[PDB]
Scaffold this active site. Structure first.
Site, PDB file in Angstrom:
ATOM      1  N   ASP A  37       6.630  10.012 -10.873  1.00  0.00           N
ATOM      2  CA  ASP A  37       6.473   9.199  -9.678  1.00  0.00           C
ATOM      3  C   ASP A  37       7.763   8.676  -9.020  1.00  0.00           C
ATOM      4  O   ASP A  37       8.392   7.774  -9.552  1.00  0.00           O
ATOM      5  CB  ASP A  37       5.535   8.040 -10.065  1.00  0.00           C
ATOM      6  CG  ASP A  37       5.236   7.012  -9.020  1.00  0.00           C
ATOM      7  OD1 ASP A  37       5.191   7.370  -7.828  1.00  0.00           O
ATOM      8  OD2 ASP A  37       5.009   5.861  -9.392  1.00  0.00           O
ATOM      9  N   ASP A 225       6.717   9.808  -1.758  1.00  0.00           N
ATOM     10  CA  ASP A 225       6.042   9.341  -2.974  1.00  0.00           C
ATOM     11  C   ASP A 225       5.229  10.403  -3.716  1.00  0.00           C
ATOM     12  O   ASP A 225       4.111  10.696  -3.333  1.00  0.00           O
ATOM     13  CB  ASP A 225       5.163   8.124  -2.590  1.00  0.00           C
ATOM     14  CG  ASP A 225       4.653   7.265  -3.718  1.00  0.00           C
ATOM     15  OD1 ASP A 225       4.885   7.623  -4.891  1.00  0.00           O
ATOM     16  OD2 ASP A 225       4.006   6.236  -3.433  1.00  0.00           O
TER      17      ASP A 225
HETATM   18  C1  LIG Z   1      -0.612   4.922 -10.433  1.00  0.00           C
HETATM   19  C2  LIG Z   1       0.398   5.570  -9.482  1.00  0.00           C
HETATM   20  C3  LIG Z   1       0.727   6.957 -10.001  1.00  0.00           C
HETATM   21  C4  LIG Z   1       1.607   4.691  -9.082  1.00  0.00           C
HETATM   22  C5  LIG Z   1       2.456   4.291 -10.267  1.00  0.00           C
HETATM   23  C6  LIG Z   1       1.180   3.381  -8.439  1.00  0.00           C
HETATM   24  C7  LIG Z   1       0.894   3.402  -6.957  1.00  0.00           C
HETATM   25  O1  LIG Z   1       0.172   2.546  -6.463  1.00  0.00           O
HETATM   26  N1  LIG Z   1       1.503   4.427  -6.256  1.00  0.00           N
HETATM   27  C8  LIG Z   1       1.095   4.687  -4.895  1.00  0.00           C
HETATM   28  C9  LIG Z   1      -0.264   5.287  -4.709  1.00  0.00           C
HETATM   29  C10 LIG Z   1      -0.769   5.235  -3.427  1.00  0.00           C
HETATM   30  C11 LIG Z   1      -1.995   5.794  -3.121  1.00  0.00           C
HETATM   31  C12 LIG Z   1      -2.731   6.399  -4.113  1.00  0.00           C
HETATM   32  C13 LIG Z   1      -2.269   6.433  -5.417  1.00  0.00           C
HETATM   33  N2  LIG Z   1      -3.079   7.071  -6.393  1.00  0.00           N
HETATM   34  C14 LIG Z   1      -2.628   7.329  -7.737  1.00  0.00           C
HETATM   35  C15 LIG Z   1      -3.836   7.938  -8.437  1.00  0.00           C
HETATM   36  C16 LIG Z   1      -4.565   7.019  -9.394  1.00  0.00           C
HETATM   37  C17 LIG Z   1      -4.089   5.761  -9.734  1.00  0.00           C
HETATM   38  C18 LIG Z   1      -4.759   4.953 -10.629  1.00  0.00           C
HETATM   39  C19 LIG Z   1      -5.933   5.399 -11.194  1.00  0.00           C
HETATM   40  C20 LIG Z   1      -6.440   6.632 -10.850  1.00  0.00           C
HETATM   41  C21 LIG Z   1      -5.755   7.439  -9.964  1.00  0.00           C
HETATM   42  C22 LIG Z   1      -4.786   8.305  -7.323  1.00  0.00           C
HETATM   43  C23 LIG Z   1      -4.415   7.387  -6.207  1.00  0.00           C
HETATM   44  O2  LIG Z   1      -5.225   7.000  -5.365  1.00  0.00           O
HETATM   45  C24 LIG Z   1      -1.025   5.882  -5.706  1.00  0.00           C
HETATM   46  C25 LIG Z   1       2.572   5.112  -6.821  1.00  0.00           C
HETATM   47  N3  LIG Z   1       3.588   5.435  -6.091  1.00  0.00           N
HETATM   48  N4  LIG Z   1       2.500   5.390  -8.171  1.00  0.00           N
END
Ligand SMILES: CC(C)[C@]1(C)CC(=O)N(Cc2cccc(N3C[C@@H](c4ccccc4)CC3=O)c2)C(=N)N1
Ligand SMILES: *[C@@H]1O[C@H](CO)[C@@H](O)[C@H](O)[C@H]1NC(C)=O
Length: 339
Positions: A37, A225
């Site tokens: 990430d 991202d």
């Molecule tokens: C976690 C995740 C990998 C982080 C560390 C945190 C974060 O909030 N983001 C942004 C983000 C924005 C929009 C969508 C998502 N995900 C990530 C995916 C997901 C996240 C959590 C549980 C199931 C699936 C599925 C989704 O919807 C993630 C990150 N840059 N990385």
């Protein structure tokens, strides 16, 4: 210091929304499925010390320090507040193997992992590919520790994200540490410099929807991202964009009538000198073409708080179309057409 090593990590594509690869922690190694990430800078995995009252811990692989001879205790508390949810625990040190490279790393052992959203996660943890400036507890990120070894050909890393195939022979994706893979892009890279070091964020000159619609008219920001599933904009930007597509808002997403899906206009993102265009096939989850079903879009509203936001985020929706190179040496991001 620069070496002559390029290390590749094979990724699994889960439903076009989660891209993860394997890492090994400890002696003997305990394996974890992790998202690499660029939108975060900390390494974390679920802990054996996580209460089994957190059901996400029951359904995930847990790190057990008691089974590792190379483990070094720390115990400092750590809380990671993300846009999708929060995780917390404490810091631990051990040996991490990622694509054949072995590195002594400080990571978070997560003891509090909420069922919403982590019961929907196919992966166990996260490998933050961001800068030390955004690292919680000022913990050195894994890429900085790999750079310190002076084994990599270049102080760069690259991402390839494939389209979700039902064929097992289909590579879900690939991260190259130390370079780029010419087998997964064509043409040349076009680079955009970072606004500032510490964030994988670039200036965006404008967003176009077909012909008659325009957003980011006076310029905006774009976070690149690898951990985000979708392309995101602010609630206001996404409200205008969705009005233009004829999409209807639900709780967590936007939808269109499936039959209307292939008729939707192109969306273009003006970055550096070039225009980065996605057609409806690139942002519509075309699960059917029925006038009797609703089809989701791989574009969502997300209000990112300052100092990083308000910003757009170019997630897996964007990276599938454009092979991405994250260049640390020159503080720039390169895009090329994926293949
Ligand atoms: C976690 C995740 C990998 C982080 C560390 C945190 C974060 O909030 N983001 C942004 C983000 C924005 C929009 C969508 C998502 N995900 C990530 C995916 C997901 C996240 C959590 C549980 C199931 C699936 C599925 C989704 O919807 C993630 C990150 N840059 N990385
Ligand atoms: C945890 O790691 C940091 C690394 O800078 C160190 O300063 C701190 O003293 C460590 N704490 C313990 C209890 O080992």
């Amino acid at each position: 210091t620069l070496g002559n090593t390029t290390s590749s990590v094979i990724l699994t594509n889960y439903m076009d929304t989660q891209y993860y690869g394997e890492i090994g922690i400890g002696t003997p190694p305990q394996t974890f499925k992790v998202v690499f990430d660029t939108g975060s800078s900390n390494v974390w995995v679920p802990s054996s010390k996580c209460s089994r009252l957190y059901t996400a811990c029951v359904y995930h692989k847990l790190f057990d320090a008691s089974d590792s001879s190379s483990y070094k205790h720390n115990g400092t508390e750590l809380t990671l507040r993300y846009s999708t949810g929060t995780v917390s625990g404490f810091l631990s040190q051990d040996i991490i193997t990622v694509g054949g490279i072995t590195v002594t790393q400080m990571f978070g052992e997560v003891t509090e992992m909420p069922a919403l959203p982590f019961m929907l996660a196919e992966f166990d943890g996260v490998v933050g590919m961001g800068f030390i400036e955004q690292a919680i507890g000022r913990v050195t990120p894994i890429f900085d520790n790999i750079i310190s070894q002076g084994v990599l050909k270049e102080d760069v890393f690259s991402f390839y994200y494939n389209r979700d195939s039902e064929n097992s022979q289909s590579l879900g994706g690939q991260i190259v540490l130390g370079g780029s893979d010419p087998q997964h892009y064509e043409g040349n890279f076009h680079y955009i410099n970072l606004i500032k070091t510490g964030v994988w964020q670039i200036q965006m000159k404008g967003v176009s929807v077909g012909s008659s619609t325009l957003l980011c008219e006076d310029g905006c920001l774009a976070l690149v991202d690898t951990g985000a599933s979708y392309i995101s904009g602010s609630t206001s930007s996404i409200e205008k964009l969705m009005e233009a597509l004829g999409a209807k808002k639900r709780l967590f997403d936007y939808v269109v009538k499936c039959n209307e899906g292939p008729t939707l206009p192109d969306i273009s993102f003006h970055l550096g000198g070039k225009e980065y265009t996605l057609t409806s096939a690139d942002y519509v989850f075309q699960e059917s073409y029925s006038s009797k079903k609703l089809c989701t879009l791989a574009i969502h509203a997300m209000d990112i708080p300052p100092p990083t936001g308000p910003t757009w985020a170019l997630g897996a929706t964007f990276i599938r179309k454009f092979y991405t190179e994250f260049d640390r040496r020159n503080n720039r991001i390169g895009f090329a057409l994926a293949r």
